[PDB]
Amino acid sequence: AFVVTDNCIKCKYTDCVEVCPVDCIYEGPNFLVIHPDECIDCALCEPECPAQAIFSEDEVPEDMQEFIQLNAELAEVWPNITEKKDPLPDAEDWDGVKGKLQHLER
Numbered sequence: 001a002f003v004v005t006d007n008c009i010k011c012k013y014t015d016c017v018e019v020c021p022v023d024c025i026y027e028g029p030n031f032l033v034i035h036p037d038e039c040i041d042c043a044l045c046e047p048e049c050p051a052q053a054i055f056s057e058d059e060v061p062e063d064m065q066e067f068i069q070l071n072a073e074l075a076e077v078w079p080n081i082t083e084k085k086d087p088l089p090d091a092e093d094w095d096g097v098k099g100k101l102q103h104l105e106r
């Protein structure tokens, strides 16, 4: 499974959803997640993320291990997104800011 981590929060560029062949991405107010059961590990999304927030499960940084299980949990409750949309207004102010998990909205 590929996993979306911290830097997607408050950026949500959604470029990853264009490229996903199986549409396994689910949408929240300010963050996106990958459904681990549905992802086919094609890796096409991670070159596409401008925030470089997507990682292969086995490459998730040590300090972002929470995100693996978070993607599995939220993907069960959030709606599927299948079309790109605009980034959040202020996405490049928040791009590269650390510790954005305290701003995650359900």
Ligand code: SF4
Binding pocket: 001, 002, 019, 020, 021, 022, 023, 024, 025, 034, 038, 039, 040, 041, 042, 043, 044, 045, 046
């Ligand atoms: S690795 Fe492929 S199947 Fe998984 S979320 Fe990324 S683009 Fe979709």
Ligand code: F3S
Binding pocket: 004, 007, 008, 009, 011, 012, 013, 014, 015, 016, 017, 031, 032, 048, 049, 050, 051, 052, 053, 054
């Ligand atoms: S910022 Fe998030 S919405 Fe997709 S393109 Fe990157 S994982």
